[PDB]
Amino acid sequence: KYGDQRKFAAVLVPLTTLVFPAVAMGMFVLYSFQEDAFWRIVPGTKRARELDEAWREHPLFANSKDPLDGLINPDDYEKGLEEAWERAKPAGSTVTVKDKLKQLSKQNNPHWESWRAMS
Amino acid sequence: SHAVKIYDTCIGCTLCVRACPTDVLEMVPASINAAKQVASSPRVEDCVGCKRCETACPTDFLSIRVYLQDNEETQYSLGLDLVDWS
Amino acid sequence: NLYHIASNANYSLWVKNPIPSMPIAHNIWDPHFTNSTSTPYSHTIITTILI
Amino acid sequence: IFRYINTTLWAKAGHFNKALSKGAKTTTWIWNLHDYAHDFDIQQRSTGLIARKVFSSNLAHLSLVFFWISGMHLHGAYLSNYDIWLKDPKSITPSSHLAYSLIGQDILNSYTSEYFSGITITSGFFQLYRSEGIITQSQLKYACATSLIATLICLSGSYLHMQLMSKFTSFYKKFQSLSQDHLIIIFGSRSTSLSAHQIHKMLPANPLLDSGISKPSILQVISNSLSYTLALFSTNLSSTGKLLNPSTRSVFLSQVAAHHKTTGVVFITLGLIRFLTMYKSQFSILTSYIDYHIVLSINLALIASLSIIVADHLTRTPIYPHKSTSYPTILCLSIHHAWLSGFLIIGSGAHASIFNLLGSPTSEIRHRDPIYSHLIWVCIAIGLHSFSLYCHNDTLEALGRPEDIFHDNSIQLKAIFAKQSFLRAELQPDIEMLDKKIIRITQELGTADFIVHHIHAFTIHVTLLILSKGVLYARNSRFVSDKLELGFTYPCDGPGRGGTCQISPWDHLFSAVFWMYNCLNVVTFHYFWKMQSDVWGFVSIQKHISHYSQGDFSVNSITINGWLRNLLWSEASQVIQSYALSSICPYGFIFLIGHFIWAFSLMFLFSGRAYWQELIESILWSHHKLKIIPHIQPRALSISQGRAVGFIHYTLGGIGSTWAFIISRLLVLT
Amino acid sequence: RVPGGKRTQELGLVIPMADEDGLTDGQVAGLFVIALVVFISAMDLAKTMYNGINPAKFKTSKGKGYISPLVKRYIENGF
Amino acid sequence: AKPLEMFGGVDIDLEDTPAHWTIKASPVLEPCKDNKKFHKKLKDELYKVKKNQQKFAEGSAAYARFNKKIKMIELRETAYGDRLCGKKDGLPRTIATGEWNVRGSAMWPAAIFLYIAGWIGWAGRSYLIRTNDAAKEINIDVPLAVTCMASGFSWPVAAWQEIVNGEMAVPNDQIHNGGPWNQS
Amino acid sequence: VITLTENGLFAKQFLSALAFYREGLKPWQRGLEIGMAHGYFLIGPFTSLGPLRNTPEAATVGLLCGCAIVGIVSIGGLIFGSTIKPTRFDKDGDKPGAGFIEMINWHAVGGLGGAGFAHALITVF
Ligand code: CLA
Ligand SMILES: CC1=C(/C=C/C(C)=C/C=C/C(C)=C/C=C/C=C(C)/C=C/C=C(C)/C=C/C2=C(C)CCCC2(C)C)C(C)(C)CCC1
Ligand SMILES: CC1=C(C/C=C(\C)CCC[C@H](C)CCC[C@H](C)CCCC(C)C)C(=O)c2ccccc2C1=O
Ligand code: SF4
Ligand code: SF4
Ligand code: SF4
């Protein structure tokens, strides 16, 4: 008969539109209370820290987060910058290149990514 | 927690400090303006984000800028009353 | 789509007389319908279908 | 005294507010100038000026209402077919409103009489005139003249009181005096005056017309001189309202005159009682509510409630002659007062919020969380119950299971208290009819009436939730702890704390207007469908009734699809197919315009002002390119103004859509 | 069937139904086997995408990695 | 080979001559005075208005106003006779090909509107230039305003003379370009 | 802020004497009592005005639906006890949330029992 496929429907439709959705919702609310929940979008999860440290352990990605990464010979760059600043230093100015860069790198933003203290 | 940054264009109005409803901002001595003072945000963990400080700032573009971070909200940045997160 | 055309449909009959005939998307299995009488989507006792 | 009434401030726009004294630097200045125009509280000078402004503005508005009445009277005397309507009201549609023959607008005037073409008015002024014994054109001339004189008098009084009242003025604060004189002299001593007017001019006249002498021997009998007719000439014993006048299809005017006399007596006796009655409990209310905004809110709520009582009592408690058969007039008189009830209730809520922010609130604001929380729960309960009975009926009817739906022929929800509410009317076991038209038959309340009444209750409760939440959470909240310093109307407190948009009481009114509109659109539709289906309609000589909607309500209004099909689609055929049809062309056009305006409101409702500000700046670039610099700098509308414009256009467009839809259909059917 | 719409009634459009079964139960089971294979593989892929790449595998995993000889050419051919 | 059936109803000119570039040679259109749909539509208008007229009294003012309306309708029928209408609608068409010499052409209204709109814009711009103040925009200097309004008639020449002489436009480096998109 | 309906003597003693709060009750006893109440009540809305309200049985269907509702709310309670883990019913030195889980399991048992008892009363009487 044209029916006889409803034997499959009477099991599949209740299953996949009631049992599977209910199990999925229960599993989702259970997953919501894991410490790993939404670790890719929610800040301050343990797995995020472990993944970042794992990336940092790779020899290629050691100095990857540094915005100044790339200077093949930073000593040459610093020496050239110091020489160029010496010829342009205003009168009896007492600022050197080294401490100027050191104090231009050190800013005061305590409340930046402070969420790296729980997980 | 949000991010409240103070820029050099500050002229020491103190209006931003007075407008803050949770004592996030404060006045610190400085030497970059005739008022010899600039604002500071030492307690942005209490910054709800009302942006009243930005409303009160009279510089051409705000010397104080509040950057909203919604995936960062804490109980203080949300103003939770019925519920404690501590 | 290919399965439901193969199983819960009438491709073998629509191909013969396509102009006045109507194809079937898939069967309707919904326990909320009337367990009595016949729905307007079925030829009396036959199963329920969608165009 | 009056030497200070100078025109020097007419050119100086924005003088009244000290925030506008800096000059029109931006276009926001214009909108602020219009917004603060009537806000006498925040305007410059002392409190005495506030009282002077309020009282004189009240007088000026009263003069405006008198001018409107005078215009209606002159239209009735010189631009109307009121003569032939008097001679034959059952065959002539009222019309005191013509249209000039320009741009083909001549197509709007329609045949109302063999000698008159015009727009059928549905204000019911002709029935009012007939109930006011107005027969000759001279009477309408003198009514218009008296109304114009009243307009001039009230205008002059408003002009005078701006300088008669002074810093020492205190007559407005004497609330005992106001209440006593108002009550006695107006509600008592003017109700008996109108009873005198009726006894001496209506009963001498309206029985003469009902006696078939529309001639009335011209002035030989109509012009009073009929002291041989007796005051209670045709009371016919019975009880007032049980037996209607068979000729005019209304309550006998002798009974109305007796009602006014007795109500005046009752009001005078209540004024005498108020010398010693129950007090010392409303006394906290007495001392804490002496302020402009609180009394304004109280009066607005009271007047709106009276308006809804008028709306429900003007339709099936017929007082006016030849008015019950005039179905468009009945429909308009119900629905207009319904809308005014909703609007003035919303205004009462707004001014309650304003009073809370200006004055000091009362004890009920301290347990505001239980109040506005059980209100939330009840709103959710009756929304998830009333509406869903419609959703349940709809789903099970679509599934083909009509025996499982909530209907009379199915699981039935009997209106137990209404079915046991035969107390009202308590008329004899039949109907009343005048001329092929049903005057009133008792509305047999069933399941659909139960469900729609619960829908009404739910919508009312949600609107009240919005209003009371705005009122109680005006000063402060767990969300923002200094809402008092933010003022009455503000866009927000900022994107902080997750977002603080629309916390002000003004925004609570903004939402409450939408919810009131949604509340009484259902009221309008319930009335418009129920009356057509179960009350109004033709008749058969064999006592059979053929209504206009053929009893669609009890069988279709149980499902939302029934409302969509049998009300908004089938009964919209008159308005939609109204082009080139003489009477109803403007109604079809206004239907289209109402749709346009309603959709236009959504641009203001859905969008924020920052996008429009940036677009305006982009355009201002092109203007500055060609040396076209507007020194009143173009600024986009403020957030509150954007919301206000959106709400106004939304309500106006929707009201116009319903207005056209109901009026065109009732004009075609009649 | 109870038709709706003007055209179906005024043209006599009908929807034929096969009196046979279509697919036998064996064919449906054969399709369900491969559907289950897809399902298992998709769950595995979802797990791998959720956890992402593990860079620290070179400290614990065996082998020494491999770059295919064409991948090297693609590296040094440019970008 | 019958282009009407080939293209599903629409017909093609199939002729390449300059004499067919005018709108009057289109086979879609037809002069209104010899179009059946035009006759039927205006006859129906006359019939409906006349049927409305008979409903009233003979000596009433409404009867006279309906007679005037009937005369207006017949005048409209005879006035649109030379206007082109489609061979299937009967509704006269508006020509937007720049013909300049056909009934219902859009060139004359376009010219008139462009002149008066440039007049309005020029008067407003002149007033704004001569009143470089916000106080003069809320309290209009009416004598100067009407002076500019009257002076705006020569806009098509004065505006061009300002365009070529560098007195209308302003270099982009003198007005606010817009929001910054970069700095770092 | 003390009100009559929550802080009056009757209100306090009524809330304290509920199965959830009654002193001296083992967690399974609270679960059993609450479940009996819920299971007995939940049969009615289905066996009457249900899809099979007019069938000759019309009550076994209601029994099955009530048991299903009891099971669903018991599953929800198990989710709550495995996620929030209330510890107000746990005895000293036990797995956290064990008291709540026992209460929920015995609520499921009591719901089954109350549903069956209501069905038995309906069929017999
Ligand atoms: C007796 C009635 C009454 C009175 C005396 C007042 C008085 C006042 N209201 Mg108020 N109000 C009322 C009814 C009333 N209202 C009602 C019924 C509502 C509900 C909608 C409100 C809602 C309301 C709000 C939300 C606010 C006020 C405010 C105010 C104050 C300043 C108003 C002002 O300057 O506006 C100036 C007048 C206007 C801007 C009028 C513009 C026209 C309106 C907005 C559009 C109407 C469209 C029109 C009907 C359709 C056009 C026809 C179309 C075909 C073209 C003042 C104390 C404001 C305030 O600050 O209070 C202290 C304020 O924020 N009221
Ligand atoms: C309406 C009313 C009310 C309410 C009431 C109520 C709320 C009731 C409830 C009731 C109920 C709710 C009841 C219940 C009951 C229950 C029961 C009675 C049960 C029993 C059970 C049993 C007995 C079981 C047993 C068992 C078990 C345990 C297990 C195993 C199996 C068996 C079966 C053995 C009020 C007061 C408010 C007011 C007015 C009136
Ligand atoms: C469109 C829009 C604007 C821009 C709209 C403005 C500035 C309206 C002012 C334009 C002129 C001044 C209105 C004057 C009236 C019209 C020119 C004509 C109306 C009547 C015609 C039918 C003739 C906002 O400023 C805004 C602000 C906040 C939320 C939403 C919106 C918003 O949706
Ligand atoms: S308001 Fe702005 S300018 Fe003034 S002190 Fe604060 S940050 Fe500086
Ligand atoms: S956003 Fe509000 S709370 Fe935060 S610093 Fe500014 S004023 Fe203070
Ligand atoms: S979106 Fe608008 S209303 Fe909401 S917080 Fe921002 S400025 Fe305020």
XYZ file of C-alpha atoms in Angstrom, chain E:
79
model
C -8.269 15.463 -0.937
C -10.248 18.688 -0.527
C -8.663 21.172 -2.953
C -8.286 24.859 -2.272
C -7.576 27.733 -4.593
C -9.513 28.736 -7.697
C -7.200 27.199 -10.298
C -7.136 23.645 -8.924
C -10.940 23.473 -8.963
C -11.476 25.257 -12.288
C -8.787 23.248 -14.120
C -9.258 19.864 -12.451
C -5.644 19.619 -11.300
C -5.204 16.350 -9.403
C -2.387 14.888 -7.319
C -1.808 11.229 -8.236
C -0.617 8.853 -5.537
C 1.262 5.644 -6.245
C -0.583 2.561 -5.036
C 2.773 0.829 -4.463
C 5.132 1.572 -1.572
C 7.909 3.588 -3.188
C 10.968 2.264 -1.356
C 11.012 -1.073 0.442
C 12.082 -1.232 4.082
C 15.419 -2.743 3.057
C 16.289 0.291 0.940
C 15.336 2.652 3.777
C 17.576 0.671 6.137
C 20.401 0.824 3.601
C 20.038 4.596 3.501
C 19.894 4.756 7.301
C 23.199 2.889 7.659
C 25.036 5.546 5.659
C 23.051 8.273 7.431
C 24.357 6.887 10.733
C 27.878 6.905 9.281
C 27.431 10.579 8.353
C 26.090 11.207 11.855
C 29.059 9.628 13.645
C 31.545 11.409 11.387
C 29.738 14.725 11.903
C 29.798 14.336 15.684
C 33.538 13.655 15.478
C 34.029 16.710 13.253
C 32.024 18.855 15.671
C 34.250 17.683 18.525
C 37.400 18.497 16.550
C 36.135 21.957 15.572
C 35.056 22.678 19.156
C 38.447 21.757 20.599
C 40.409 23.301 17.730
C 44.047 22.797 16.834
C 46.444 21.610 19.533
C 49.867 23.214 18.923
C 51.493 21.491 21.903
C 51.208 18.086 20.197
C 54.889 18.195 19.208
C 55.824 17.734 22.879
C 53.807 14.523 23.363
C 52.580 13.107 20.041
C 54.799 10.607 18.240
C 56.214 11.020 14.752
C 57.851 14.197 13.528
C 55.160 15.800 11.365
C 55.233 15.994 7.596
C 54.988 18.683 4.926
C 54.033 17.210 1.568
C 56.528 17.967 -1.234
C 53.905 20.048 -3.055
C 53.116 22.026 0.099
C 56.770 23.080 0.301
C 56.641 24.202 -3.335
C 53.458 26.162 -2.626
C 55.207 27.751 0.359
C 58.200 28.900 -1.680
C 56.236 29.718 -4.851
C 54.818 32.788 -3.109
C 51.541 33.812 -1.499
